[PDB]
Amino acid sequence: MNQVSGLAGKESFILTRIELFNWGGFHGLHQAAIHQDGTAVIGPTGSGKTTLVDALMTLLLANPRYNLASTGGHESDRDLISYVRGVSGPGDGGEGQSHIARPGKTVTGIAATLEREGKQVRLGALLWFDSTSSSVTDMKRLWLFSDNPGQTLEHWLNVYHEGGTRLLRQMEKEAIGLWTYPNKKQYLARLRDFFEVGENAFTLLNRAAGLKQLNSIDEIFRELVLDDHSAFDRAAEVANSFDGLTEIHQ
Amino acid sequence: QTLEHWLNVYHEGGTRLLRQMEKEAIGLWTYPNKKQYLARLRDFFEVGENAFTLLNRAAGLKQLNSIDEIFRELVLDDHSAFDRAAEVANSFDGLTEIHQ
Amino acid sequence: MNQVSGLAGKESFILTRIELFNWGGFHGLHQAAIHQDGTAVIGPTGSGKT
Amino acid sequence: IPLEEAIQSLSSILIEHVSQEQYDINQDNPFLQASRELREWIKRRLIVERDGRIFATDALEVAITFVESLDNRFMTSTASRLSTVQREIENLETRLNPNPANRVATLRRRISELERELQEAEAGHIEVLETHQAVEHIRDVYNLASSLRADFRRVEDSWREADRALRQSIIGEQYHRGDIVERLLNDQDALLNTPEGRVFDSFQQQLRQSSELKAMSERLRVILSHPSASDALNRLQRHDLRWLVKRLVDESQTVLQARARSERDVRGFMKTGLAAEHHRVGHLLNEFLNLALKLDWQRQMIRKQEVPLPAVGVAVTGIPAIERLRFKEVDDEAEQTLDLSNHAADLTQIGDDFWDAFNGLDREVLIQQTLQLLAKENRPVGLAELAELLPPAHDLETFAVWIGMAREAGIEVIDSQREFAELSDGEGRRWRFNLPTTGLESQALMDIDWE
Amino acid sequence: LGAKALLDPRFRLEFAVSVMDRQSGNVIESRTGSQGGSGGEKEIIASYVLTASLSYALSPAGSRYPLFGTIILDEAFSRSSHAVAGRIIAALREFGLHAVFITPNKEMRLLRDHTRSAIVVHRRGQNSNMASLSWEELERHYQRRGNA
Amino acid sequence: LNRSSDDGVTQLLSHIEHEVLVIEERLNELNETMFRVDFQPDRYLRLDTKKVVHESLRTLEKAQRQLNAARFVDDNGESHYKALQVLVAQLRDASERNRTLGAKALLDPRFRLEFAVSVMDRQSGNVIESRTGSQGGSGGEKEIIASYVLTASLSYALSPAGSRYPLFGTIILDEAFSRSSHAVAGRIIAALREFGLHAVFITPNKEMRLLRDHTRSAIVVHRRGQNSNMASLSWEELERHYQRRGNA
Amino acid sequence: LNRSSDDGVTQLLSHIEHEVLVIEERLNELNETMFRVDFQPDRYLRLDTK
Amino acid sequence: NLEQSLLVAILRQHFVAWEQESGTGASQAQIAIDDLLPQLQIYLGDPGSESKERTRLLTLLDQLKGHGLVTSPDAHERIVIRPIIAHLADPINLQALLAWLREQIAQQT
Amino acid sequence: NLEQSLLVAILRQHFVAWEQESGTGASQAQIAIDDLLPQLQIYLGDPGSESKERTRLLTLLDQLKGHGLVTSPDAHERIVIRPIIAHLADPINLQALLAWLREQIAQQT
Amino acid sequence: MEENTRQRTENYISAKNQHPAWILLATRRAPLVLSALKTLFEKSHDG
Ligand SMILES: Nc1ncnc2c1ncn2[C@@H]1O[C@H](COP(=O)(O)OP(=O)(O)O)[C@@H](O)[C@H]1O
Ligand SMILES: Nc1ncnc2c1ncn2[C@@H]1O[C@H](COP(=O)(O)OP(=O)(O)O)[C@@H](O)[C@H]1O
C-alpha cells in the first residue's frame, strides 16, 4: 500500500520531525516524528490537530491560508501573532487576556526536518516578542535553513536565551551549512531554489491542505489548480490614461 | 390513501381521474399549482414560510462560517430596503427636475 | 444520552415513512420507514442518500 | 395576509363554523367559498389588497373596534385616567400662561416637589405602583395610545384623496403649468392645515428629534416585560404597543407614496415645450380626456360601446382553406404497465468495508473496561501492559484512546523512552507497535468525567 | 459592503455568540472577531444556533415545543469528533426535534447508540435501492455474514 | 494616442492571450503526467479545454479587428480614437462588473477557456466517458475528481525541471476525508501513492479503519484545557511470517 | 421640496433603525429559547449584538 | 371600443412625449406598466385590489396587441408602443372621435 | 382534436356513402341528431349526461360549421353535410384513424 | 392564544341577537332614532 514511499524517498524529501515551542496552546517544548511511509494525526476536535499543520505551513509560504480547512475557500481565521501569543479566542466580553497564554514578552519557535536518501534538510524559524504590543510590525522574526542535522531547535532556543539574536547571526557564519534570513523572501527563494520549484507550487500545497467545497468540473481547475493573475488593475490604469486621452480629444 | 394508490389511479384513468377522486374521497385534496399547496402546508403546521426556508438551507449547511454569516443568510427573514431608497432618490430627482 | 427522547415524540409531528417511485436513481417503487426515536441513513459514497 | 395564505386560512375558519348551522353556508367546497367571500369583502371596500398582500380598511378596523367595545371592552373611568388628565391639564395651563413670573413660581414649586421626592427616594423609601394597580395603569396607556392608529387610518385616506383629486384635475385643458404648480402647493398645504394634517406634522417633527420616539419605544419594551403586563394585555395587544412607533412610521409611508405619486404626474406634465404638431395633438388628447371623465365608466354597457375610429393597421388572416386541415395521431398506443412491485433491497450486496465500519470500536466500553481493570491492578500500567492485559481487537484506535485518557488525566508521557508490544489483526496477520512510556492509575483516572 | 451596511437592516449588527454559566453572572466565553479557528468548535456552535433558531421558527407562537420537529441533518458531523457529536445529538433532542441523520457509511459507532433505526441504500450502476433496518436486525445480518 | 497605443487595449489583449496559451501549456503537460498513473483499474485521466464561447468575447474580437483596420488609415486618428474609445469603454464596463461571469470572461485569464476531463482506456486509448460522472458534485464523488486533479497538479508542480518524480513528496492534508467513504479515501491514498507523494493526514479520530492500513505512525494530540501535549505512535509488520503456514 | 424629500429621507432612515430594533428583539427572543437547553454540562449559549 | 380607445389615448400621449425626446427616432417607445395603472384608475375607478386592476390593464393591453398597437409585456413589465398608433390616433381621427363623443355626452343629458 | 377527427371521419364516410347512393353531387348529404348521438357515443361513451351529450355534439357541429364542413341543425335537428368534404387534405390519415377506431371499438368490448 | 377563536363567533352571535346597541344599529330606522336620542341627551347635566 505504501511500498512506493521508499522510492519516493529515492526521489524526494519527506518531513520526519516537527519541533515546536510556545506555539499555540503547546506551551514549552514539543516534538513529533513521522514514519517514512506516511503518518496520520489524531485527537478530539479542538485539540490542536490543525494547529500543528499551520505551524508547519508557516515555514513554506509568504502568507498561507492559516486554518484554511476550517472555513474552506473563505478567509483565513488566524495570523502569526495569534499563534505566537497562544491565543484561544475572546474568553470573555471584558477581554481580560486570560485566554491569552503569552500576552507578555516571550519567545517562540518552529522547526522541521526532512530526509531524502538519508541526507537531511532542516528548516526553522524564531518568533519573539520583546514587548506586549501585538502588531505585525513588532513580530520580529528570523527564518533559518540548514542541511546539517547538527543544528537543533533546542540549541537555537538555548542560544537565544544566552544572548540576543546577533549570536544566531554569528553562529550562522560559524556553523557549516547554515543560513539565517531576517526577512522571509530570501528564505523562500532559497527553499524554492533548493527544491527547483516555483512558489505557486507551495500555494497549491496550501490549497491542498484545506481542499474544500466546489460546485462543478470547471471549478476544480479554476479555483484549485491555476493562479488567476487577473489583469483588472491593468484595466483600471488603461481607463485612467484613456481619461486624459479623451480630455485631450475633447 | 397512499402513494401506491395515487399512482395506481393516475395510470388507471387519466389526470382527470385524480381530481375526480379528490371529490369522491374524504380527507383528500389536490392543488395543481404549487403555491396553493404550500400555503396549505404552512397553515396546517402553523409556521411561516421562513421556517421551511430555514429548514432546507439548514439540512445541508456545511459552509458553517462565522456566526454573522449564519444569521444574515439563514436566520433572519429578508426585508432589505434597497428599492425604497431607489424610490426616494427617484422622487427627489423628479422634484429637482421640477425645480430646474 | 437518549432518555430525553420521551418528550421528543409527544407534542410534535414526526416523519415516519417515505414512499417513493421512479424518483432520481430509485427506479420502480420503494419505501423507507423512519423510527420516531431517531434514524440514520447510510450508503456508499454517492448511493442515493442526498 | 398574503392572499394565497388568506384564502386557505379563511377556508379553515369557515370549516370551523359549519357547526353554526343556523347560518346558511356552502357545504361542498369550503375553499371556493373562502375565495368568493374574500372577493365580496374586496367589493365592499372592507379589505384592500395591494402587492399581493391584504390589509383591513379603516371601515373594518372601526367595525372591529365596535364589537370589541361590547362586553369584553376596556374601561377608561379610571383613577389612572384622572391622574393623566390632572397632570396634562397642569401642563396645558402652565404652557398657556404667558406671565413669566407665574411660570417661575410654577417651576419653583415643581422643583421643590421633585426635590422632596428625591429626598424620600434617597431615604430608601421609594414607592412602586401597587402591583395590582399596575394592570389598570397599563391598560390606561394602551387604550389611550390605541387612538393613534385609528387616526393614521384616516390621514392616509385624506392624502390619497388629495392625490386623486390632483390627478383628475390636472387633466383639465384649462389648466396650464402655472396652474398645476400652484394647485400642487395649495393642495398639499391645505391638507397639512387640516387637523389630521397637524397630527401628521407633529409626528414628523418628532422624527427630527428621534431620541424621544426611540426613548418611548425602549420604555414600552421595558414596561411589557414587567409581569403585570401579562395580566392587563394578551400577547396581541402587547405585540401592538411594543411596536406602536414602528407601525406609525410604516403607516406614514403610504402618505409619502401618494405624495410622490402626484409629483410623478406633475413632472410628466410640466415637460410640454413641444413642437407644432405635437402641440396640436396634445390639445386634442387633453380635450378628449376631459370629455372622457364625464362618462359613467362603472357601467359595462357604456364601456363596450364601439367608437368610430377608422380601421388602420388592418390585418387579414385565417383564410379557410379546406386543405389546411390536419388530423390526430394515436399511433403511440403501447401501454406501459405499472412497476408497482416492491423493489426493496436485499443486504447481500453490502460490501465488506461497510461491515468493517459497522464494527467500529466502542470508545465508552473501552473507557469503562480500562477503569475497571486498573482498579484491580492498582498501580501504574504502560500501554503495552494494557494490551497484554486487554486484547485490542480493533487495534490502533485503542492505543489512541488509552493515551487520550492518560493525557486527559494529566498523566505524564515520556515520548523519548519507549516500550513495545506484539498483536495480530482479525485475519491473523501479526503486527508490532512502538509506544511511549506512561502509567495509568485508576483513582486519578476515574476522578474525572468521560464521554 | 457599504450598500448593505446602509440599506440592509441586519448588516448593522454583529452576531457574536457567548457562553453563560448556569449558576453565575460571568461570561465564560465569547466568539467574535477571531472566529475561534477550531473546525469542531465552529461546527458545534453553528449547529446549536441553527437548531435553536429552527425550533423557534417551527413552533406555533407561544409553544415551547415545535409542531413540526423533523430536521434533516446531513453529515455536518464531518468536522465533529465523537465528543462533540454526542453533544450535538443531545442538544437536538432537548430542543424537541427528531433528527433523520445522513452519513456516508462512516462514524456509525455513536449512531448505533443514539439512534434506533437506519436506512441502508445501494449503489448499483445506474440504480439504487433502500431498506429499513433496526440496529439489531442489522446486527444479526452482520453475524450471519461472519458465519457464512 | 500613439503613446497610448503600445500601452493600450491591444497590448493588454495580447497579454491575456499569452496567459491563456500559458494555461494551455500547463494543461497539456499535466495531461501528459496523468498518463503515468491510473484513475481506475483500466483507465487513466485526461484533461481537455476549449475557448469560451461567450458572445462578449466575440464582440471584443469584432472591436479589435475594427481597431486593427483603423490603426493604419489616416484621418489624424479620428477613427483610431473612435475604435480605441469603444474598446476601452467595453473594458471599463467589464472592470466595473468584474464579479459577474461576463466580465470575468474578458479580464480573467482562467475564464477565457472551459475545461473537461475524460475517462481514457489505459489499453487502447479510446474514450469511454468525456466528462465527470456527476453533473454537480454527488457528495463524495466531487471529492474524487477534485483530490485526484489537485494531487496530480501538486505532484507535477513539485517535480524539478524535467524530473518525472516530485522532489518534495510531503503533501499535507487537513480534515482529509471529511466527506468521503472508505471506498473513496482508499482510492485517494492509492492515487497519492501512484504520484509518489508522501502524505500526512489529519482527522478527528475518523476513518481509523483506513488509516490503520495505509499509514505506519500516528501523532496523538490532546488538550488539557488551555494546554495540549503530544506523543508519537507507530507500528510495522513483523517479518518472520503473517501466521504459521496460514492466511496472508 | 426641502420639506417633502427631507420627510421621505428621514422616514426611510428611521424605518431602517426600527428594522434594526426588530432584529435585536428577535435576538432576545432566541436567547430566551436557548436558555432552555444546556450547551455544555453546566452552561448555555446566548447571543449578543453590537 | 372606448376602453381600448382610452388606453389608446394614454398610449398616444406617452408616444408623442417619447417622440419629443428624439424626434421619430427608433421604435423603442418604452414605458413601465406601473405608469399606466395610475392613469386608468382615474377613469375606470379603483376596484380596491391592485392585482385586479393589473389584470384588467393586461387584458386591455392584450386586446390592443391583438389590434397590433402594442408589444406584449416582457420580463421587466415594459411594453413598446407600435408606431402604427400615430396613424390610428391621427389628429383627424382624434377630432372625428372627439366630435362623436361630444355628441354622445350632449345626448346623455 | 381526436373528437373532431372522429366526427369528420364519420361525416366523410357518410357523405361518400350518400354519393354512392345518389351519384356525385345529386343531393347534399344529411344526418339527424337521432342517428348521430349513438354513433358518437359508440366511440366516446357517456360524458356524464344526455344534456352533456347534446351539448358536446352541437359544440363540435358548430366548430365544424366554422370550418365550413357542416351546417347547423335545422328545426328538425338535421344537418347538411357540405359538399366541400370531398376535398380534404389527407384522407389517408382519416382512413388510418378510422382503422384504429374500428379496432378499438371491438377491442374494448 | 387563539383557542377561544371558535367560541368568539358564538359570543358575537349572542351580542348581535341580544345586546341593545347592536340591535339598534341594525334597525331600518336606526339613524333617525339614534340622532333624536343624541340630540335629546346632548344637553344633559344629569338625568
Ligand atoms: N490562534 C487561535 N485563534 C483562535 N483560537 C485558537 C487559536 N489557537 C487555538 N485556539 C483554540 O485552541 C484550540 C486549537 O485547536 P485546533 O487544532 O485549531 O482545532 P481542531 O482540532 O478542530 O483543528 C482550539 O480549541 C481553538 O479553539
Ligand atoms: N443532477 C445530478 N447531479 C449529480 N448527481 C445526480 C444528479 N442526478 C442524479 N444524480 C444521481 O443521483 C446520485 C446522488 O448521489 P448521493 O448519494 O445522493 O450524494 P451523496 O454522496 O452525498 O450520498 C448520484 O449517484 C447520481 O447517480
Which triple of cell numbers denotes residue I44?
Answer: 366516446
Q: Is F169 in the pocket of ligand 2 (CB under 6 A)?
A: no
Q: Is E38 in the pocket of ligand 1 (CB under 6 A)?
A: yes
Judge whether F130 and F27 are in contact, CB under 8 Å. no
Q: Does D301 touch chain I (CB under 8 A)?
A: no
How far is D311 from chain I, CA to nearest CA, in Å?
A: 25
Q: Does B5 touch chain D (CB under 8 A)?
A: no
Cβ contact, residue pair B67, E4, below 8 Å: no
State how far Cα D113 lies from the chain centre. 45
Cell 368490448 belongs to: I109
- Encode F194-214: b = buried (16+ Cβ within 10 Å), e = exposed: bbbbbbbbbbbbbbbbbbbeb
CA distance D34 to D39: 9
Q: Does C43 touch chain E (CB under 8 A)?
A: yes
SS3 labels along E14-73: CCEEEEEECCCCCEEEEECCCCCCCHHHHHHHHHHHHHHHHHHHHCCCCCCCCCECEEEE
| ∠ CA D176-D179-D180, rounded to 5° | 90
Side by side, which strands form the sheet with G43-48? E27-31, E16-21, G43-48
CA distance D235 to D245: 17
Which triple of cell numbers denotes residue I24?
Answer: 356525385
Cβ contact, residue pair D415, A31, below 8 Å: yes
Cβ contact, residue pair G1, B76, below 8 Å: no
Q: Is A102 in the pocket of ligand 1 (CB under 6 A)?
A: no
Q: Is F246 in the pocket of ligand 2 (CB under 6 A)?
A: no
Judge whether G44 and G33 are in contact, CB under 8 Å. no
Question: Ligand 1 centroid to F222 CA: how many Å?
Answer: 12
Q: Does D256 touch chain G (CB under 8 A)?
A: yes
Bridge partners of residue F223, in order along the sequence: F228
Judge whether F208 and E107 are in contact, CB under 8 Å. no
CA distance D266 to D186: 14
Q: From residue D117, how far is each of B72, D91, D103 by CA, in Å?
A: 48, 19, 21
How far is D218 from chain J, CA to nearest CA, in Å?
A: 25
Residues 6+ apart with CB under 8 A from H16: D274, D278, D281, D282
Question: Ligand 1 centroid to A48 CA: how many Å?
Answer: 6
Q: What is the DSSP letter of F179?
A: T
Judge whether H47 and D292 are in contact, CB under 8 Å. no
Q: Do chains F and H touch (3 or more CB pairs under 8 A)?
A: no
Judge whether F205 and A43 are in contact, CB under 8 Å. yes
CA distance F104 to F81: 25
Residues 6+ apart with CB under 8 A from A145: A121, A122, A123, A124, A178, A179, A181, A187, A190, A191, A194
Tell me the chain E residues in contact with residue G34 when contact means C-beta distances shorter than 8 Å.
Answer: 48-49, 52
* Count of other CB atoms within 10 angstroms of residue E41: 19
* Count of other CB atoms within 10 angstroms of residue A23: 24
The conformational region for residue F152 under phi > 0 = left, psi -120 to 50 = alpha, else beta, is: alpha
Q: Is F181 in the pocket of ligand 2 (CB under 6 A)?
A: no
Cell 540549541 belongs to: A155
The conformational region for residue E62 under phi > 0 = left, psi -120 to 50 = alpha, else beta, is: left
Residues 6+ apart with CB under 8 A from F163: A11, A196
CA atoms within 13 A on the CB side of G35: 9
State how far Cα D29 lies from the chain centre. 31
The H-or-E segment that residue A79 falls in is none
G-chain residue closest to E96, CA distance: G37
For chain I, how many helices (H) and strands (E)?
Answer: 4, 2
CA distance H71 to H77: 11
CA distance D137 to D128: 12
Residues 6+ apart with CB under 8 A from A250: none
Q: Does A209 touch chain F (CB under 8 A)?
A: yes
Cβ burial of I66 (10 Å; 0-12, 13-18, 19+) is exposed
Closest CA to F232 of D386, A112, A33: A33
DSSP-derived secondary structure for D227-279: THHHHHS-HHHHHHHHTHHHHHHHHHHHHHHHHHHHHHHHHHHH-----HHHH
CA distance B59 to E73: 5
Cell 462512516 belongs to: E106
Handedness of CA A100, A105, A106, A108 (dihedral sign): positive
Which triple of cell numbers denotes residue G43?
Answer: 452552561
CA atoms within 13 A on the CB side of J32: 3
- Collapsed DSSP state (helix, strand, coil) of residue D417: strand
Q: What is the DSSP letter of D322?
A: G
Residues 6+ apart with CB under 8 A from F174: A49, A50, A53, A68, A69, A209, A210, F202
Residues 6+ apart with CB under 8 A from I57: I33, I36, I37, I40
CA distance J23 to J43: 25
Interfacial D residues in 276-335 facing A (CB < 8 Å): none
Q: Is C41 in the pocket of ligand 2 (CB under 6 A)?
A: no
Q: How far apart are the first and last CA of chain C?
A: 27
Judge whether F171 and A208 are in contact, CB under 8 Å. yes
Handedness of CA B58, B63, B66, B72 (dihedral sign): negative
Judge whether H3 and H61 are in contact, CB under 8 Å. no
CA distance A11 to A2: 15
* Count of other CB atoms within 10 angstroms of residue B7: 17
Residues 6+ apart with CB under 8 A from D260: B87, B91, B94, G8
CA distance I36 to I43: 12
Closest CA to D168 of D292, D282, D258: D292
**Maximum alpha-carbon separation in chain C:** 39
Q: Is C25 in the pocket of ligand 2 (CB under 6 A)?
A: yes
User: Which atom of ligand 1 is found nearest the CA of A43?
Assistant: 21
Cβ burial of A71 (10 Å; 0-12, 13-18, 19+) is buried
Residues 6+ apart with CB under 8 A from D150: D58, D61, D62, D65
CA distance F92 to C39: 55
Cell 384513424 belongs to: I97
Q: Do chains E and F touch (3 or more CB pairs under 8 A)?
A: yes
Closest CA to D356 of F185, F73, A212, A171: F185
Judge whether I85 and I11 are in contact, CB under 8 Å. yes
Closest CA to H26 of H90, H85, H82: H82
CA distance H29 to H11: 10
Q: Does D400 touch chain A (CB under 8 A)?
A: yes
Bridge partners of residue I70, in order along the sequence: I81
CA distance D364 to D382: 20
- Encode D275-295: b = buried (16+ Cβ within 10 Å), e = exposed: eeeeeebbebbbbbbebbeeb
Q: What is chain G's Cα-based Rg?
A: 18
Cell 528564505 belongs to: A187
- Collapsed DSSP state (helix, strand, coil) of residue A36: coil
Instruction: Supply the angle between the helices A232-249 and F9-33 in degrees, to the nearest 10.
Output: 160
SS3 labels along D80-114: HHHHHHHHHHHHHHHHHCCCHHHHHHHHHHHHHHH
Q: Give the determination technique.
A: cryo-EM
Q: Does G8 touch chain B (CB under 8 A)?
A: yes
Handedness of CA A235, A236, A239, A244 (dihedral sign): negative
CA distance D223 to D134: 10
Residues 6+ apart with CB under 8 A from D385: none
C-chain residue closest to D342, CA distance: C29
CA distance A224 to A73: 10
Q: Does F147 touch chain C (CB under 8 A)?
A: no
Which triple of cell numbers denotes residue B73?
Answer: 443568510
Bridge partners of residue A15, in order along the sequence: A114
Cell 477534485 belongs to: F146
Cβ contact, residue pair H88, D313, below 8 Å: yes
Residues 6+ apart with CB under 8 A from D293: D168, D171, H42, H43
The H-or-E segment that residue B27 falls in is none
Q: Where are the beta strands (DSSP E) in D290-439?
A: 413-424, 430-438
Question: Ligand 2 centroid to B52 CA: how many Å?
Answer: 23
Judge whether A206 and A68 are in contact, CB under 8 Å. yes
CA atoms within 13 A on the CB side of C41: 22
Which triple of cell numbers denotes residue D217?
Answer: 419605544
- Interstrand relation of C39-42 and E117-123 (parallel, antiparallel or unpaired): parallel
User: Which atom of ligand 1 is found nearest the CA of A48?
Assistant: 17
- Collapsed DSSP state (helix, strand, coil) of residue D22: coil
| Alpha helix segments (H runs only) across D334-395 | 352-358, 363-377, 383-389
Q: Is F140 in the pocket of ligand 2 (CB under 6 A)?
A: yes
CA atoms within 13 A on the CB side of D447: 11
Closest CA to D341 of E129, B10, E124: E129
Cell 407633529 belongs to: D202
Handedness of CA D89, D92, D94, D99 (dihedral sign): negative
Amino acid (1-letter code) at residue B94: G
Tell me the chain D residues in contact with residue G17 when contact means C-beta distances shorter than 8 Å.
Answer: 210, 214
Cβ contact, residue pair A49, F193, below 8 Å: no
CA distance A59 to A125: 7
Q: From residue F113, how far is each of A217, F48, F130, I66 by CA, in Å?
A: 13, 10, 17, 58
CA distance A244 to F3: 12
Q: Is F183 in the pocket of ligand 2 (CB under 6 A)?
A: no
CA distance D38 to D14: 12
Q: From residue D163, how far is each of D184, D254, H42 by CA, in Å?
A: 9, 12, 11
Cβ burial of G8 (10 Å; 0-12, 13-18, 19+) is buried
Residues making up chain G, counted from first to last: 50
Which residue's alpha carbon is at the smallest distance from atom 15 of ligand 2?
A: C46
